[PDB]
């Protein structure tokens, strides 16, 4: 009654608790062992950073039952505005004690005002300073502490291990995890505390620094006692957004903490943190859906970007089926990067806007529902730190502003990113509502969320564990597993870190969690560790547990190599995932832990594995896995040798191929895969299988698992992208098998004959096997081949349809909505001169048809599977989408035919037949079937910038060209520093962002999209906005783009006010004419803008809309007029043969011959004579301009100053070049014509133009002694550090020649004296090698200046 203590009891222990405070006196286990609690009179409560000591009258006690007691704490400090009533519950179960704050009453508040308004006198933080829930003493046998802190550094362990002695002295020393052991018992302390504290290494915040355990020493008689307490909890935290507005936000959860008392749990004869860690798994928080992590064998990213729809959802479903066949149905985790809006880094933060061009929510749900049947999980890439004006969530309140009230700018790429006010986004309920929008679209189908950048301080200067906990909670509340970017980020809730799993990123200081404590506890729950990447050293040098090594083949950073993706899965990920099916129980002889790095008490067992590293793991069925290192010496070849045993039988042995791709290994394995790919339950004994891999290839012998020992034979299948192949029956002798394997080739072993995984290619795609994934058999079972020619499935990576000769490949279309409009498009690369066609028929009648001659535009789409870095044929790819538009017939009978017409030997490639509902109806034909008109407002584009295709101005890239979207007033001119409208008409336009001074083609039409008939005339018009005068130009060409063989028309500035462009085009003789947008060499006018305003202003941008192409009437000509025009052209240019390029004369002859065909044909009409005449007029205009260019170069070389002036006035291209690529400026600088140089620069010549050797005019000026020419060039923006094709800079040439003035001017403008050419020679090295010792010392003095 008046007894100051009570007893709580379980079958495992009895605990004495104090009645005057929620403190434990001691824990007594059934076996009699004792663990101390808080032996001293400590009654401290901290509220809002104020310590308050409680007296007898401040605490009431109630024993509810033998397993529970309740405390009521009166916590008051009038001077500090604290008047609280805290209800504390202590409960016991088995060897666990829980301490929970079940109620917090604030007597000084009415609660949080509506809309998270500021709560005056809010209880923000709460803790129990030095509560010592568990403690160990220096007087106890083997008294010790083990702690863990966050480390993303492979060379810096996060752990600490030390003996607790009389000298141990700590005060609130904070750890993510803390374990104490002494007198045969061990305990860890768990808490849900969101406190941020001490860390070892982390490049970011975002929950990296969460430290939940406080260790404090006190004197208990003659001994030093080390006690564990929880770090402080947040309750009603008051926060401030970027505009100074304050909010009070309610708790993520009420304060909770627990301890679990362990004896010798792993039965190794020692009691230490590992025993405590085993018991700790029963009380710790577990990331939501962490139980499925061991099933996620195949992680990868499927990418979409810039309106292109590189990976529509139903294509991703086919790729899941390809991976399922190749892995024999192992689980997958597919990250959809760009699932929303126009693709990756478009539409942030509109989480609910599913990419309409990918097939929207409907296809995303079909993909997820069908994919789950193959064990594939899906998740989406979201961003809560950066937004774009186009996003409907974009608002003034969402905008993060700086101290001055200016925008906190993000990255400019397709559009200008703006920082999100992270505090406002949380406190206002805005972020949780956008997650609810996404939940409405996906229901319960989506597995996870991938949260990009969180922790890098883009949303606020905090992004602490408290914000991260709330972020993870709103995600988990929708049934989504949490995953994030940074290796160290979100320790509490994340199951995957992209910078931990993709080992190539960030280097050795910014990887996954380098902690033995954390990995011991949670290896099976996360892909957040350090895998094999030996160039990083330490933790990354052959970790025994392996660690996820992620690769991709669906466009992320241009990654498309399917075979390397599968090879990598088998090299590292199968064994890593096998190991994750077991929980660590013992880990000794860790070479990373030394007395030097604060780990003197780490366990060194010379009786385990010769004193070398070893890990024992167990599952709940008593199965045992042992993982052993060959040697603990990094200089030994045995350091990378690993043996894996399963119930004492060797299942893996050898050295893995280096995770950094630098050295093939010799590891072989025969891994028993006992689990289904769904919840990971054991499969029926009869369907149990083994995966076999042999790195070097050859023959190995293995002992089969115990349940296979009495079999007389096994069935072995080689796994391919077609599934199980080459069945072999292999004899079993004395429970052993011998297997012959090709190098790096996967095999699957069954007890008996195994059936093929059922695959129906291209479900929901209206055709079977739209991507030609069905092997050779698809051309028999799915597609119908007819003709004298050949049809084959070609390519070992992304398989394609390849046609040769006269051949048709057809298939019936299914599931079309009768009377509805559809676009059908197909990727096509035609190397043949003959036409390649796509046709939709219905009962033999043509509904729609399209064709391409030889393909003229290389593919520059980085995220696309057939870009020009992927080698379709002859080291290139010309893949471009070819469209047909039709109405699904009422009879429900429609067929697609892919065909090749000519009988030649050249190839046509097709891939990805896509049938999609689409309302585009802007093409009108002539009775002929030729083009009458094409109109496009870009409001109904199935994908891309059709009828244009992205050109090579950035090479193979995530091209800064896409379909811009309206969101007034934010996307319009006048918002903030924005001077250009993103959209001109309706909701969509074509936008080019910052592609100035490229001196090349940005985008163009191609004949398969818009065909211009030879000799026919067309009026082309469009609306546009351009940031500056002459930065962009209309380009008109014929055939594959050639610099110099295009007609250019500069476009004037139209900034915030829509301009109109119109021109006429005559179709070239080869039917390969096109028009497009070209980026000139002209610098933009930035109008005094600085910083981000230079990009956000729109000075460097180009927007196009309302495209109109129409065939027009040309003045009718007689046969006589056309014949006279031939005589006129021949009279002008036949004599100019010697003065012309071999290709220029052939083009001239080609055009003449074709014009004469039109004129002299039997039955030729007025239209033929008119076309012949118009072809000859276009030929004349072309030949004329080439002669003016040729004369401008000749006048520049010879030094005819006035002749140069009239030639440029008459139309000569200032950026024209000769045989060796010299522009008139190169020729003027080389010969030393200072006036000609000045005139050419005034006209608009490229100051940094490169010839065939990579020489700029400055290289030629400096090397020939033209001082003023050098100064003029530098004033106009000549790159002083321009390096030629041998790495030679103007300073190298200047030092090699011998004049100080050159050296001085160059150095003054910023010449790098440490510039090395391809032979490693600096300008100084070239000076000493010619007898130029004078310049050498001046160069030496210049180099020593910055030493």
């Amino acid at each position: 009654s008046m007894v100051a203590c009570e007893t709580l009891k379980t079958k495992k222990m009895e605990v004495q608790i104090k009645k005057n405070f929620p403190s434990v006196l001691q824990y007594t286990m059934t076996d009699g062992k004792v663990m101390y609690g808080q032996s001293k009179d400590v009654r401290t409560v901290e509220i809002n950073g104020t310590n308050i000591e409680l007296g007898d009258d401040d605490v009431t006690f109630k024993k509810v039952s033998d397993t529970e007691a309740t405390y009521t704490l009166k916590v008051k400090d009038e001077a500090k505005k604290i008047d609280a009533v805290i209800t504390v519950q202590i409960t016991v179960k088995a060897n666990q004690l829980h301490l929970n704050v079940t109620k917090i009453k604030n007597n000084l508040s009415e609660g949080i005002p509506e809309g998270n308004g500021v709560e005056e006198n809010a209880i923000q933080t709460l803790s129990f300073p030095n509560q010592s829930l568990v403690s160990v003493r220096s007087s106890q046998e083997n008294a010790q502490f083990t702690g863990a802190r966050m480390s993303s550094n492979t060379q810096k362990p996060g752990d600490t291990n030390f003996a607790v002695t009389e000298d141990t002295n700590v005060t609130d020393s904070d750890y993510t995890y803390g374990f104490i052991s002494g007198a045969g018992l061990s305990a860890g302390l768990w808490s849900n505390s969101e406190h941020d504290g001490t860390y070892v290494a982390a490049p970011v915040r975002g929950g990296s620094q969460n430290t939940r355990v406080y260790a404090t020493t006190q004197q208990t008689g003659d001994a030093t006692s080390l006690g564990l307490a929880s770090a402080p909890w947040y309750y009603h935290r008051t926060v401030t957004d970027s505009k100074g507005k304050k909010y009070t936000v309610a708790e993520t959860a009420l304060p909770q903490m627990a301890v679990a008392i362990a004896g010798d749990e792993n039965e190794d004869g020692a009691v230490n943190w590992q025993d405590g860690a085993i018991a700790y798994r029963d009380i710790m928080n577990n990331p939501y859906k962490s139980e499925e992590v061991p099933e996620l064998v195949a992680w990868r990213i499927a990418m979409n970007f810039g309106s292109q729809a590189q990976n529509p959802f139903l294509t991703t479903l086919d790729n899941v089926k390809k991976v399922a066949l190749n892995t024999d149905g192992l689980g997958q985790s597919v990250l959809l990067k760009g699932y929303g809006n126009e693709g990756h880094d478009s539409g942030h933060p509109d989480y609910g806007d599913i990419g309409q061009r990918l097939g929207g929510a409907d296809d995303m749900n079909t993909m997820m529902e069908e994919g789950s049947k193959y064990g594939a999980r899906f998740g989406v890439h979201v961003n809560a730190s950066e937004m774009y004006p186009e996003a409907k969530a974009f608002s003034e309140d969402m905008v993060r502003r700086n101290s001055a009230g200016g925008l906190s700018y993000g990255w400019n790429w397709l559009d200008q990113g703006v920082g999100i006010d992270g505090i406002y986004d949380l406190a206002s309920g805005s972020r949780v509502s956008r997650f609810a929008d996404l939940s409405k679209e996906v229901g319960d189908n989506m597995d996870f969320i991938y949260l990009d950048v969180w922790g890098n301080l883009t949303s606020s200067g905090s992004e602490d564990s408290w914000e991260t906990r709330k972020m993870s909670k709103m995600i988990n509340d929708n049934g989504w597993r949490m995953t994030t970017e940074w290796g160290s980020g979100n320790e509490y809730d994340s199951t995957f870190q992209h910078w931990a799993a993709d080992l190539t990123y960030g280097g050795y200081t910014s990887k996954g969690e380098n902690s033995e404590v954390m990995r011991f506890l949670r290896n099976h729950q996360k892909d957040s560790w350090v895998g094999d990447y030996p160039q990083y050293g330490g933790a990354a040098n052959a970790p025994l547990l392996g660690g996820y090594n992620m690769k991709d083949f669906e466009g992320w950073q241009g990654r498309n190599d399917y075979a390397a993706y599968i090879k990598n899965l088998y090299t590292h990920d199968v064994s890593t995932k096998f190991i994750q099916h077991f929980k660590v129980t013992r880990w000794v002889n860790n070479p990373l832990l030394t007395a030097d790095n604060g780990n003197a008490a780490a366990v060194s067992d010379p009786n385990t594995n010769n004193g070398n590293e070893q890990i024992t793991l167990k599952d709940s069925n008593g199965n045992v896995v042992v993982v052993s290192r060959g040697s603990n010496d990094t200089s030994s070849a045995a350091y990378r040798q690993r043996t894996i045993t399963f119930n004492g039988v060797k299942v893996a042995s050898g050295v893995v191929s280096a995770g950094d791709g630098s050295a093939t290994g010799d590891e072989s394995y025969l891994l028993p895969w006992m689990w289904d790919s769904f919840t990971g339950k054991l499969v029926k004994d009869s369907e149990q299988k083994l995966y076999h891999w042999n790195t070097k290839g050859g023959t190995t012998t293995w002992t089969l698992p115990d349940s296979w020992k009495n079999l007389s034979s096994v069935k072995v299948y080689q796994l391919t992208d077609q599934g199980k192949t080459n069945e072999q029956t292999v004899a079993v002798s004395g429970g052993k098998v011998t297997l012959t394997a090709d190098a790096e080739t996967p095999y699957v072993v069954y007890k008996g004959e195994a059936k093929q995984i059922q695959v129906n290619w291209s479900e929901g795609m209206h055709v079977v096997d739209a991507g030609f994934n069905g092997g050779s058999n698809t051309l028999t079972d799915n597609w119908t081949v007819s003709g004298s020619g050949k049809a084959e499935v070609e390519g070992d990576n992304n398989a394609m349809l390849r046609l040769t000769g006269k051949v048709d490949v057809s298939q019936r279309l299914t599931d079309l909505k009768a009377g509805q409009k559809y676009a059908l498009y197909v990727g096509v690369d035609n190397r043949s001169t003959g036409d390649a066609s796509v046709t939709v028929t219905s009962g033999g009648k043509v509904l729609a048809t399209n064709s391409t001659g030889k393909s003229i535009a290389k593919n520059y789409i980085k995220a696309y599977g057939h870009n020009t870095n992927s080698n379709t044929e002859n080291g290139s790819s010309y893949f471009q989408n070819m469209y047909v538009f039709f109405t699904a017939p009422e009879n429900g009978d429609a067929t697609v035919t892919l065909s090749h017409k000519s009988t030649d030997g050249a190839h046509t490639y097709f891939d990805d037949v896509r049938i999609v509902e689409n309302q585009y109806s802007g093409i009108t034909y002539e009775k002929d079937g030729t083009l009458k008109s094409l109109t496009n407002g870009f409001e109904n584009n199935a994908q891309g910038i059709w009828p244009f295709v992205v050109s090579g101005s950035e090479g193979v890239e995530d091209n800064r060209i896409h379909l811009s979207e309206l969101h007034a007033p934010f996307t319009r001119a006048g918002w903030d520093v924005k001077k250009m409208d993103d959209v001109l008409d309706g909701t969509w336009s074509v936008k080019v962002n910052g592609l100035t001074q490229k001196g090349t083609l940005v985008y163009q039409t191609i004949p398969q999209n818009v065909k211009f008939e030879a000799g026919a005339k067309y009026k082309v018009s469009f609306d546009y906005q351009s940031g500056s005068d002459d930065i962009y130009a209309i380009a008109v060409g014929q055939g594959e783009y050639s610099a110099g063989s295009v007609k250019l028309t500069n476009l004037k500035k139209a900034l915030g006010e829509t301009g109109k462009a119109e021109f006429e085009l005559t179709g070239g003789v080869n039917g390969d004419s096109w028009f497009g947008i070209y980026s000139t060499a002209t610098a933009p006018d930035l109008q005094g803008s600085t910083g981000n305003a230079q990009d956000f202003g729109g000075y460097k941008d180009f927007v196009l809309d309302n495209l109109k192409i129409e065939r027009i009437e040309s003045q009718t000509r007689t046969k006589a007029e056309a014949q006279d025009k031939v005589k006129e052209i021949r009279g002008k240019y036949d004599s100019k043969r010697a003065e012309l390029s071999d290709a220029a004369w052939q083009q001239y002859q080609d055009t003449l011959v074709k014009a004469r065909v039109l004129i002299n044909k039997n039955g030729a009409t007025a239209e033929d004579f008119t076309k012949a005449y118009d072809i000859l007029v276009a030929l004349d205009e072309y030949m004329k301009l080439k002669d003016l260019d040729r004369k401008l170069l000749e006048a520049a070389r010879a030094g005819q100053d006035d002749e140069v002036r009239i030639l440029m006035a008459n139309g000569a291209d200032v950026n024209a070049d000769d045989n060796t690529g010299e522009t008139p400026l190169h020729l003027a600088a080389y010969e030393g014509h200072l006036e000609i140089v000045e005139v050419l620069l005034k006209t608009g010549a490229d100051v940094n133009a490169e010839d065939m050797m990579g020489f700029t005019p400055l290289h030629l000026a400096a090397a020939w002694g033209h001082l003023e020419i050098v100064e003029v060039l530098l004033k106009h923006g000549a790159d002083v550090n321009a390096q030629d094709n041998q790495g030679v800079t103007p300073l190298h040439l200047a030092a090699y020649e011998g004049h100080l003035e050159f050296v001085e001017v160059l150095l003054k403008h910023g010449a790098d004296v440490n510039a090395q050419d391809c032979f490693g020679k600096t300008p100084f090295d070239l000076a000493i090698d010619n007898g130029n010792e004078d310049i050498a010392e001046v160069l030496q003095k210049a180099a020593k200046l910055g030493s």
């Binding site: 190169h1226 020489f1255 030629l1260 094709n1285 030679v1288």
Partner: peptide, 15 residues
């Protein structure tokens, strides 16, 4: 190894 005078179609290095 020989360094020559640069010009149209003539690279700085020829060995």
């Amino acid at each position: 190894p020989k360094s020559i005078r640069i010009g149209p179609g003539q690279a700085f290095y020829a060995x």
